[PDB]
Amino acid sequence: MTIFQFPQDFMWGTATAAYQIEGAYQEDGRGLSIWDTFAHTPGKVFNGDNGNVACDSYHRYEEDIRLMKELGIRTYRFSVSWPRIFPNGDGEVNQKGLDYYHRVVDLLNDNGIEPFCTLYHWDLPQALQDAGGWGNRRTIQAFVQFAETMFREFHGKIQHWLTFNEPWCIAFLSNMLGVHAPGLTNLQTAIDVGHHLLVAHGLSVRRFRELGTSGQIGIAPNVSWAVPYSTSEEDKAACARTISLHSDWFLQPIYQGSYPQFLVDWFAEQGATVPIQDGDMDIIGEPIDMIGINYYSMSVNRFNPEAGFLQSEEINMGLPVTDIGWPVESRGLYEVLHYLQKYGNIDIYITENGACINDEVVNGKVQDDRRISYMQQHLVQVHRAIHDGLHVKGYMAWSLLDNFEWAEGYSMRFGIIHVDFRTQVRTPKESYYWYRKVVGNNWLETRR
Amino acid sequence: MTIFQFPQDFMWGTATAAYQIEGAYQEDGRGLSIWDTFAHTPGKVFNGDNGNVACDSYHRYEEDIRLMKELGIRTYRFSVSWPRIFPNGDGEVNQKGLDYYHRVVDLLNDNGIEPFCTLYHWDLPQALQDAGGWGNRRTIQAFVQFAETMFREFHGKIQHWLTFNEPWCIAFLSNMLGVHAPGLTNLQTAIDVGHHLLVAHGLSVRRFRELGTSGQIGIAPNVSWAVPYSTSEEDKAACARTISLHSDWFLQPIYQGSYPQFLVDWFAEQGATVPIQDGDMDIIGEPIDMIGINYYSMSVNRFNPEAGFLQSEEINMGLPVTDIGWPVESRGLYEVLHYLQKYGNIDIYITENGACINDEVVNGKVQDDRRISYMQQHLVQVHRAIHDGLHVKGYMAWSLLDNFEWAEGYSMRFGIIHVDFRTQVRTPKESYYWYRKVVGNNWLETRR
Amino acid sequence: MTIFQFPQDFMWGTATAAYQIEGAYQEDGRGLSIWDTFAHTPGKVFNGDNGNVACDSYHRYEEDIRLMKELGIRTYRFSVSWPRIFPNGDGEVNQKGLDYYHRVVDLLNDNGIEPFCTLYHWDLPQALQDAGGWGNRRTIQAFVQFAETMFREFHGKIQHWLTFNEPWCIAFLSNMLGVHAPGLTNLQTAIDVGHHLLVAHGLSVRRFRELGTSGQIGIAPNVSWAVPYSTSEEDKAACARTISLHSDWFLQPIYQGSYPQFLVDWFAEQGATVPIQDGDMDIIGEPIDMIGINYYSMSVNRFNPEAGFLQSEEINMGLPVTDIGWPVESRGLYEVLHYLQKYGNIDIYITENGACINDEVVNGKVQDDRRISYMQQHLVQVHRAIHDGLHVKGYMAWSLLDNFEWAEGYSMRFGIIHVDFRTQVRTPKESYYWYRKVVGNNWLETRR
Amino acid sequence: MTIFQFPQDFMWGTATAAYQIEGAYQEDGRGLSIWDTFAHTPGKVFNGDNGNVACDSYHRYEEDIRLMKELGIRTYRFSVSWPRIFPNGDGEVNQKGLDYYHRVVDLLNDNGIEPFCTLYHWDLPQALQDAGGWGNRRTIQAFVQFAETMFREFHGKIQHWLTFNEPWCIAFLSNMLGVHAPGLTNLQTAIDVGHHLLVAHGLSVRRFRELGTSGQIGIAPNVSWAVPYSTSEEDKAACARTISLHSDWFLQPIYQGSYPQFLVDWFAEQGATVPIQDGDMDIIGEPIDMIGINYYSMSVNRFNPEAGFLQSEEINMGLPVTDIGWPVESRGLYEVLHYLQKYGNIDIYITENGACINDEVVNGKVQDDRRISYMQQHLVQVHRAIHDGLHVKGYMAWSLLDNFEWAEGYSMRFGIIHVDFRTQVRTPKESYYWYRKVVGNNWLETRR
Ligand SMILES: N=NNCCOCCOc1ccc(-c2cn(C[C@@H]3NC[C@@H](O)[C@H]3O)nn2)cc1
Ligand SMILES: N=NNCCOCCOc1ccc(-c2cn(C[C@@H]3NC[C@@H](O)[C@H]3O)nn2)cc1
Ligand SMILES: N=NNCCOCCOc1ccc(-c2cn(C[C@@H]3NC[C@@H](O)[C@H]3O)nn2)cc1
Ligand SMILES: N=NNCCOCCOc1ccc(-c2cn(C[C@@H]3NC[C@@H](O)[C@H]3O)nn2)cc1
């Protein structure tokens, strides 16, 4: 019915993370992460799943890259397992660790696929967690050394860099709500972890600059969009809190040199303060070349005093949901892209977008029509924003592979390629071939 | 997992129209309407369907009323076949015609079901169409005689009245786009039909008072909602035209004594003018007690000069659609009700809301889950508006029965009760038992 | 391949309750009960189900009695809707109420079906709940007036009487755990309700004699069985608490004139005391002719301080469960009957035993093999106890009809006759024809 | 719902036996067994199945061991084909025989899998049976030489040893009931075979000690658990006979230096006596390091004079049964583990536990949910006993592979891995992957 044509140099991609796909959790001197520890704790991850084996992409990456070439993709976003480089986070490197990632990146560049490297996708070496992890400013220097080691080792091989993936998850999901590793439930710790994350980000971009490292560097928050149930100022405040804690809390420091004051005030009445030290805000405000945004769903919220620490309750409006329960409402991606212009018409990459659809292989194919539907509606919104003049530069599907989906284990499938975890067999889904058509054509035609 | 509770006085109902359900088109001296003529012309209605038999509700109204009694609804919205009362539309009444609506209306009242009487649901007697139909002010007086006769015979039996159902369909779809009877394609004619419709409404309302007829009176427009694809003024203009022709074009005269000037300007540059005669604007501005709103779908539009006489192109956003092709996006219902607050916090009834879901009887049941899905999402928006303080007084599902869906014939099913047109067997759908629960409880719970 | 033959005098029956099946909740001057109020409150009953219509056994009792006649059962256990007799619970009787139970009871007797009359199956008139309900000794006198009126009008027509059905549910599930009407969560209140229940039982029994009313009278507790996970004294203590609150708490006063002291001690350390007034313990100890026992499931428990007010955690042993989640382990029925020999070899009827098996009608049949499986295993335990010399006199399957299963609504089917709640059509399940054979033959044969 | 966590050094395993899996029945000089002879007799084994080919594990063991490594198992229990070592049972060894088992054990140790070696799993060389088999004390010395040859040949390669598997089967099933090879029906012969088995066990442990052989050594009885139908002393005696003949008959000699006197008395009235010679009881009482117990089912028994030579009749209580007809009641494993403390808190391995579930491969997988269910309930009971302080040290699933299931042939499948006997293809069942999770995690979570 309608054709949606994309910019000539638009960057089409797919995305993974190291712990979700790699496996080989004890191989080549790799040290333990806080997620190994968390997944090896009963009751923390559904069905007692863990990432020991996952997709075995530590051994099978060549097959995965061949599939990405046939997909016609232009970029591949991946993360580096910190404990594969610094098993303890303390200076003594593991060359085997570095050697793995060199084989990966060389195959990517030899196939015409630009690496998009996420440094921190949640696998803090357990060694550093023992000392307090991100709640301890000592981890700041350990990360800066980790980033520096990568900036040095892959200079000229990698042109796109991200420091941290989804700071709201690392800070508040992990240390306020206890849902992800390390599993704490204390607001003050969550705020501490966020701040030390912003400082470690600042210091790593600085090093990037001073090292003259090739390419550009930014950060990749997951973005919330909530819309008020009523016209009340209370419901509007509740949505502002939900929205701002995901994005503004981390971006207003980076771009505007301050935390969102209304959230500062809110936490202060809960007895928490940001542990800002002298020079910190100056470190966080180091200029970045772009940001990545991660989008999945949006909500209709109202104010409720009993609804968690943000007193923001989500309403079930009856919309259809993915197989993980998130409602499909693609307009939120357009709204939030316009919302973020408050930081300017900055370069924006869509670093994650996808749907949980748990169809498996029947008669040799995975008929994940609901995933094509999801992608169609949301790719319409990307084109829509680009047309409004926003500098949206790329789009990465979450995910290339079905993988270990954190506290849900393997029960929640996000890939455009099916993985049978008993055999490690890869089966491109129907969304894979549909996506191959869109990226190969560089235009979308909405149908069905 | 959210509870939505409705006001104690909330009016739950169901809606039909005479030609869509009644049948008996040559029975008891009923004369031909423009829809008999249109449906008897090859090429006009899908598959050559017509309303000669329909649901045979001329004979089976007792079963239909038994089913709505077991449904627990408090109101039943129906329309009167004009050529059953005045077969030629020129004075000699058909007591047989009046007799039918008396057994229906009395049977409703005896069951505690409030009649909600639509006088004009598109079945204009062919005799008046020969004289030019609505383009000829002579039928204005013919309609006023019809309404008086109905107020006269049914005083105290009907407490809720509507003059016209969906004026934009009567005028522009029928006489500009040629899709509905009488099927002309002339801009100026469409504007004439619209104006004389409003004059007949004003005069019938001005007479309603003068007779002291029981109850309240209003009009039931179908309501459009469009949102711009881009931020441009042209796209916002294109959406304003789409929205305003459905509602503003008719409601601004009634409430504010003027036509939307920006559309007047639009048509005058196409060679069309409104034939206002002295006293007309004052006849139209006769105060009404409430309005009905008919909502199905909403759209994302852009400005396009090649896109019809409103130059407003609606974009396929990839959203899921019903079995007739209309996307499901319930927030437009919340949006348009707030839009309509420009006319004051007037009493508003949702006289139509529904979905084409073409599921048939399998193992004795109609598993129309997509209709339950649609109805729940839109009933959430009704509660949301009432909660915002808007005077939303009732809700009528379109439709009680699968019926003759105009140019689509019987191929497009909207009912909550399935009708097998080969046997006339009624089978309540799963949506029926779902609705029975909501109306009996007077609160909704989001699920699935 | 084993034959189990039952005594010649063995009483085979079926069991229902008034609110679960009757419907006609506003018909013939029936007043509101606490379950009407509870089921009409959002959030209390799954899906917002209620008993307004239920199985419509207020009107369809003749069909239900025809089906139990063809079943060949010798007794039918039913309960009396108190607010059908005394709508406000304060003296002015409703002859219409009494009339209904007279046509039922006479129709049963005419068919050779012995009425087994439960006076209280949880439908306390709302008027008394406004005054505090069972926590207020004033309703004690209100109940005694109810029972006398029933002994009075139904002398010689009913030869089997039960005062209360499942006292632990009436007291602790309803007023400590808040799961059943009236839904409070107060320890002290629950103990008050329990004590005043026993006083009303004693007085109604003491009056039973004094009126020389025909037949025998007892009480029908639901019975718990728990076995310790470990050999520890704490685990055995935790199981003793679980077991004793269901049965001992009520049966030790009636038979041995004292409350279980170890639970008295338990509650007194939580701040709760039994409100015994002079003469109370002697009123309760009124001799009764037999008891009813209600058995469904048994458990493996351990001591856990965080595990509710009894600090007894039941362990998921991995056993298969019914469609409501209760594990099937029939030996607890044999176990608890032997346990109850501490009160002498008293006459015991199994007034309830059944399974939630949610199979529906497929090709005209309900292939509820898991219900046949459950019933056979438990009827083996009945024969085993009789063979051990215990005075087990009868067995009533819960339930005759799929009905309103309290906080689960209609989603949890226990019937041996399927009821389609959209049509009220009765379809006897395969368990029905299976039961017809066992009761007609008066012996069981193990198979499958 | 509940997590069951196991001891850190708990030994997870799987189990096989030589004749059930090996095949190559005439290869490399292997001599005939009493089971070859029995399976080659018409009417003895269902469908005329035999073990000539079986699973061909004589040739395919490398595939089976690779599958066991991926399973994450810590031990593998297997048996040695006596006629592969001593084709005639008389001194002249077959080095080829020894060579096969050396290739097996070396692959096991190289993969980190500890061998658990059963010396006698029923394949008595037919040569020795011709001379009377176990009914002849000459076989005692032939076995001691066989065991000595293995103790010598695999010293330092094998650390866990069992002399005999299921003496009740070798003695009473084979020589009293005629169900297994050699198929005799004479009580006196059965008693003779049992006694010569106990002496050959004693002499082999002694040799083990005197040889200083590596590791520990014990015996692996199959254990009965019967529970009385009634409270009668007769039913309790009948259960004691059933229970004691399986375990006490062999363990009371080994631990307490005497046969169970009440069974001695019982057989004496049937004209049978134990052929005890001077020094025999002293040989049998040689100390052992541990025992293995084999558990599958439990029964409810009563006394019946016509019910076999133990006058102990099993009652069909209506419980669900595996596909071989044995009821699933996991509590018997806990009861019998406590029962055996009468011999002290000895080290106990669960050397066989499994279910007959005959699901085959459908759409590439074997959906043996009933096997996962069975294992879940019984693994709960192992944890339960460990928690009571019993020295339960390991658990071995029966079986790794579908195999030749004695008189039932191949029609009764026990494996966690499917074997197609027409192709020899191995397919891990769903229980395989479920078991992999449990052993890899070392905890169980009960679900479904
Ligand atoms: N009672 N209240 N407290 C607890 C209430 O539940 C709280 C659970 O919250 C959440 C919220 C959000 C997520 C989540 C997962 N992704 C997708 C991953 N993206 C990064 C990549 O690696 C993907 O795998 N995005 N968001 C999970 C859980
Ligand atoms: N060239 N391209 N072709 C497509 C050209 O279509 C242009 C638009 O056509 C239309 C537009 C709108 C309708 C319509 C039907 N209802 C539902 C009824 N409501 C009144 C009641 O009686 C119900 O039965 N509401 N609106 C039908 C046709
Ligand atoms: N927080 N966790 N949530 C779970 C909290 O549940 C706690 C326990 O709830 C219960 C416990 C027991 C029952 C119950 C139902 N019957 C069957 C009926 N017998 C009387 C007859 O009328 C039948 O209809 N017997 N017992 C219901 C609910
Ligand atoms: N009329 N009366 N007489 C005859 C009545 O039937 C008697 C039949 O008895 C039995 C009793 C028990 C078994 C049996 C098989 N396993 C399983 C194997 N375990 C060792 C391993 O190798 C497995 O393959 N355990 N027990 C077979 C038959």
PDB file of C-alpha atoms in Angstrom, chain A residues 222-369:
ATOM      1  CA  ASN A 222      17.148   2.387  26.695  1.00  0.00           C
ATOM      2  CA  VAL A 223      14.365   4.888  26.360  1.00  0.00           C
ATOM      3  CA  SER A 224      11.004   4.937  28.089  1.00  0.00           C
ATOM      4  CA  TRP A 225       7.906   6.596  26.711  1.00  0.00           C
ATOM      5  CA  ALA A 226       4.825   6.894  28.890  1.00  0.00           C
ATOM      6  CA  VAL A 227       1.670   8.785  28.090  1.00  0.00           C
ATOM      7  CA  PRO A 228      -0.755   9.929  30.830  1.00  0.00           C
ATOM      8  CA  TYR A 229      -4.037   8.221  31.425  1.00  0.00           C
ATOM      9  CA  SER A 230      -5.779  11.457  32.560  1.00  0.00           C
ATOM     10  CA  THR A 231      -5.257  15.182  31.940  1.00  0.00           C
ATOM     11  CA  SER A 232      -4.157  15.570  35.577  1.00  0.00           C
ATOM     12  CA  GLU A 233      -0.807  17.153  36.411  1.00  0.00           C
ATOM     13  CA  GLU A 234      -0.202  14.137  38.726  1.00  0.00           C
ATOM     14  CA  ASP A 235      -0.448  11.638  35.861  1.00  0.00           C
ATOM     15  CA  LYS A 236       1.708  13.920  33.756  1.00  0.00           C
ATOM     16  CA  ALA A 237       4.302  14.063  36.536  1.00  0.00           C
ATOM     17  CA  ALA A 238       4.231  10.284  36.879  1.00  0.00           C
ATOM     18  CA  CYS A 239       4.942   9.926  33.145  1.00  0.00           C
ATOM     19  CA  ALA A 240       7.741  12.519  33.303  1.00  0.00           C
ATOM     20  CA  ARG A 241       9.387  10.540  36.119  1.00  0.00           C
ATOM     21  CA  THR A 242       9.151   7.253  34.199  1.00  0.00           C
ATOM     22  CA  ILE A 243      10.389   8.884  30.981  1.00  0.00           C
ATOM     23  CA  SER A 244      13.200  10.957  32.536  1.00  0.00           C
ATOM     24  CA  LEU A 245      14.745   8.236  34.721  1.00  0.00           C
ATOM     25  CA  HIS A 246      15.408   6.107  31.634  1.00  0.00           C
ATOM     26  CA  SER A 247      16.953   8.810  29.366  1.00  0.00           C
ATOM     27  CA  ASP A 248      17.189  12.304  30.899  1.00  0.00           C
ATOM     28  CA  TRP A 249      18.868  11.029  34.101  1.00  0.00           C
ATOM     29  CA  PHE A 250      21.878   9.950  32.016  1.00  0.00           C
ATOM     30  CA  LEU A 251      21.710  12.363  28.993  1.00  0.00           C
ATOM     31  CA  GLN A 252      21.098  15.660  30.800  1.00  0.00           C
ATOM     32  CA  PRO A 253      24.421  15.194  32.653  1.00  0.00           C
ATOM     33  CA  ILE A 254      26.191  14.328  29.393  1.00  0.00           C
ATOM     34  CA  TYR A 255      24.685  17.120  27.297  1.00  0.00           C
ATOM     35  CA  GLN A 256      23.518  19.765  29.773  1.00  0.00           C
ATOM     36  CA  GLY A 257      25.931  19.112  32.690  1.00  0.00           C
ATOM     37  CA  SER A 258      23.252  18.486  35.351  1.00  0.00           C
ATOM     38  CA  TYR A 259      20.940  15.706  36.633  1.00  0.00           C
ATOM     39  CA  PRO A 260      17.186  16.196  36.135  1.00  0.00           C
ATOM     40  CA  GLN A 261      16.308  18.365  39.123  1.00  0.00           C
ATOM     41  CA  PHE A 262      12.758  17.094  39.613  1.00  0.00           C
ATOM     42  CA  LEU A 263      14.071  13.525  40.013  1.00  0.00           C
ATOM     43  CA  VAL A 264      16.879  14.720  42.303  1.00  0.00           C
ATOM     44  CA  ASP A 265      14.183  16.322  44.449  1.00  0.00           C
ATOM     45  CA  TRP A 266      12.082  13.123  44.325  1.00  0.00           C
ATOM     46  CA  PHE A 267      14.902  10.810  45.498  1.00  0.00           C
ATOM     47  CA  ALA A 268      15.964  13.339  48.130  1.00  0.00           C
ATOM     48  CA  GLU A 269      12.595  12.757  49.826  1.00  0.00           C
ATOM     49  CA  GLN A 270      13.431   9.048  49.817  1.00  0.00           C
ATOM     50  CA  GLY A 271      16.763   9.747  51.536  1.00  0.00           C
ATOM     51  CA  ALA A 272      19.035   9.278  48.526  1.00  0.00           C
ATOM     52  CA  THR A 273      21.545  11.721  47.066  1.00  0.00           C
ATOM     53  CA  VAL A 274      23.805  11.492  44.020  1.00  0.00           C
ATOM     54  CA  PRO A 275      27.418  11.029  45.237  1.00  0.00           C
ATOM     55  CA  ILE A 276      28.802  13.827  43.015  1.00  0.00           C
ATOM     56  CA  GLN A 277      32.415  14.709  43.651  1.00  0.00           C
ATOM     57  CA  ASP A 278      34.361  17.698  42.459  1.00  0.00           C
ATOM     58  CA  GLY A 279      35.152  17.525  38.716  1.00  0.00           C
ATOM     59  CA  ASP A 280      32.632  14.664  38.145  1.00  0.00           C
ATOM     60  CA  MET A 281      30.013  16.639  36.186  1.00  0.00           C
ATOM     61  CA  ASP A 282      32.948  17.999  34.112  1.00  0.00           C
ATOM     62  CA  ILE A 283      34.022  14.452  33.283  1.00  0.00           C
ATOM     63  CA  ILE A 284      30.466  13.352  32.375  1.00  0.00           C
ATOM     64  CA  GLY A 285      30.037  16.328  29.997  1.00  0.00           C
ATOM     65  CA  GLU A 286      32.788  15.164  27.654  1.00  0.00           C
ATOM     66  CA  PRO A 287      31.390  15.664  24.110  1.00  0.00           C
ATOM     67  CA  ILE A 288      30.044  12.629  22.284  1.00  0.00           C
ATOM     68  CA  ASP A 289      29.656  12.060  18.564  1.00  0.00           C
ATOM     69  CA  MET A 290      26.258  10.314  18.724  1.00  0.00           C
ATOM     70  CA  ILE A 291      23.935   8.263  20.911  1.00  0.00           C
ATOM     71  CA  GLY A 292      22.190   4.926  20.481  1.00  0.00           C
ATOM     72  CA  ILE A 293      18.595   4.486  21.633  1.00  0.00           C
ATOM     73  CA  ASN A 294      16.926   1.137  22.466  1.00  0.00           C
ATOM     74  CA  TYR A 295      13.136   0.986  21.975  1.00  0.00           C
ATOM     75  CA  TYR A 296      10.594  -1.809  22.466  1.00  0.00           C
ATOM     76  CA  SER A 297       7.310  -0.607  23.928  1.00  0.00           C
ATOM     77  CA  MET A 298       5.473   2.352  25.413  1.00  0.00           C
ATOM     78  CA  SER A 299       2.959   2.650  28.209  1.00  0.00           C
ATOM     79  CA  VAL A 300      -0.014   4.617  29.411  1.00  0.00           C
ATOM     80  CA  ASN A 301       0.716   5.536  33.060  1.00  0.00           C
ATOM     81  CA  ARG A 302      -1.005   7.282  35.954  1.00  0.00           C
ATOM     82  CA  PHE A 303       0.082   8.408  39.386  1.00  0.00           C
ATOM     83  CA  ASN A 304      -0.289   5.836  42.180  1.00  0.00           C
ATOM     84  CA  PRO A 305       1.446   6.205  45.577  1.00  0.00           C
ATOM     85  CA  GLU A 306       1.829   2.403  45.950  1.00  0.00           C
ATOM     86  CA  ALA A 307       3.289   1.888  42.442  1.00  0.00           C
ATOM     87  CA  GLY A 308       6.959   1.504  43.183  1.00  0.00           C
ATOM     88  CA  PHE A 309       9.534   4.127  43.995  1.00  0.00           C
ATOM     89  CA  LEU A 310       8.429   6.397  41.106  1.00  0.00           C
ATOM     90  CA  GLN A 311       4.752   6.174  42.110  1.00  0.00           C
ATOM     91  CA  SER A 312       3.962   5.618  38.423  1.00  0.00           C
ATOM     92  CA  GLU A 313       1.458   2.869  37.579  1.00  0.00           C
ATOM     93  CA  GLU A 314       1.074   1.356  34.092  1.00  0.00           C
ATOM     94  CA  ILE A 315      -2.440   0.689  32.812  1.00  0.00           C
ATOM     95  CA  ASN A 316      -3.292  -2.412  30.733  1.00  0.00           C
ATOM     96  CA  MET A 317      -5.137  -0.755  27.832  1.00  0.00           C
ATOM     97  CA  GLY A 318      -5.969  -4.108  26.211  1.00  0.00           C
ATOM     98  CA  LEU A 319      -3.451  -3.791  23.328  1.00  0.00           C
ATOM     99  CA  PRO A 320      -1.906  -6.935  21.798  1.00  0.00           C
ATOM    100  CA  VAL A 321       1.353  -7.994  23.438  1.00  0.00           C
ATOM    101  CA  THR A 322       4.459  -9.840  22.309  1.00  0.00           C
ATOM    102  CA  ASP A 323       5.179 -13.257  23.784  1.00  0.00           C
ATOM    103  CA  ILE A 324       7.021 -11.577  26.683  1.00  0.00           C
ATOM    104  CA  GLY A 325       3.981  -9.408  27.384  1.00  0.00           C
ATOM    105  CA  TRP A 326       4.985  -6.044  26.077  1.00  0.00           C
ATOM    106  CA  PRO A 327       2.301  -4.127  24.125  1.00  0.00           C
ATOM    107  CA  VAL A 328       3.026  -3.181  20.506  1.00  0.00           C
ATOM    108  CA  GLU A 329       2.625   0.593  19.999  1.00  0.00           C
ATOM    109  CA  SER A 330       5.183   1.832  17.449  1.00  0.00           C
ATOM    110  CA  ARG A 331       4.271   5.543  17.751  1.00  0.00           C
ATOM    111  CA  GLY A 332       6.304   5.851  20.955  1.00  0.00           C
ATOM    112  CA  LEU A 333       9.512   5.475  18.969  1.00  0.00           C
ATOM    113  CA  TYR A 334       8.538   8.572  16.903  1.00  0.00           C
ATOM    114  CA  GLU A 335       7.424  10.578  19.966  1.00  0.00           C
ATOM    115  CA  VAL A 336      10.612   9.873  21.906  1.00  0.00           C
ATOM    116  CA  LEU A 337      12.793  10.658  18.891  1.00  0.00           C
ATOM    117  CA  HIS A 338      11.196  14.137  18.807  1.00  0.00           C
ATOM    118  CA  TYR A 339      11.439  14.396  22.624  1.00  0.00           C
ATOM    119  CA  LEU A 340      15.233  13.904  22.493  1.00  0.00           C
ATOM    120  CA  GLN A 341      15.694  16.937  20.221  1.00  0.00           C
ATOM    121  CA  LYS A 342      15.834  18.831  23.533  1.00  0.00           C
ATOM    122  CA  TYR A 343      19.509  17.770  23.371  1.00  0.00           C
ATOM    123  CA  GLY A 344      19.722  18.986  19.789  1.00  0.00           C
ATOM    124  CA  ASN A 345      19.507  17.254  16.457  1.00  0.00           C
ATOM    125  CA  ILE A 346      22.203  14.842  17.606  1.00  0.00           C
ATOM    126  CA  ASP A 347      23.171  11.800  15.566  1.00  0.00           C
ATOM    127  CA  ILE A 348      20.977   8.886  16.703  1.00  0.00           C
ATOM    128  CA  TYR A 349      21.374   5.166  15.954  1.00  0.00           C
ATOM    129  CA  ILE A 350      18.555   2.682  16.693  1.00  0.00           C
ATOM    130  CA  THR A 351      20.843   0.195  18.433  1.00  0.00           C
ATOM    131  CA  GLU A 352      18.047  -2.273  19.520  1.00  0.00           C
ATOM    132  CA  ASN A 353      14.487  -2.839  18.286  1.00  0.00           C
ATOM    133  CA  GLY A 354      12.763  -6.228  18.183  1.00  0.00           C
ATOM    134  CA  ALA A 355       9.946  -8.420  19.437  1.00  0.00           C
ATOM    135  CA  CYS A 356       9.678 -11.524  21.584  1.00  0.00           C
ATOM    136  CA  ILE A 357       7.917 -14.041  19.290  1.00  0.00           C
ATOM    137  CA  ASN A 358       8.451 -17.673  20.346  1.00  0.00           C
ATOM    138  CA  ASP A 359       7.535 -19.483  17.139  1.00  0.00           C
ATOM    139  CA  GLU A 360       9.809 -22.454  16.550  1.00  0.00           C
ATOM    140  CA  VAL A 361      10.718 -24.482  13.437  1.00  0.00           C
ATOM    141  CA  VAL A 362       7.738 -26.205  11.797  1.00  0.00           C
ATOM    142  CA  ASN A 363       8.246 -27.918   8.395  1.00  0.00           C
ATOM    143  CA  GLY A 364      11.726 -26.406   8.043  1.00  0.00           C
ATOM    144  CA  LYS A 365      10.848 -22.723   8.616  1.00  0.00           C
ATOM    145  CA  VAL A 366       9.998 -20.296  11.428  1.00  0.00           C
ATOM    146  CA  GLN A 367       6.819 -18.476  10.407  1.00  0.00           C
ATOM    147  CA  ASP A 368       7.285 -15.460  12.689  1.00  0.00           C
ATOM    148  CA  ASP A 369       4.758 -13.221  10.937  1.00  0.00           C
TER     149      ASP A 369
END
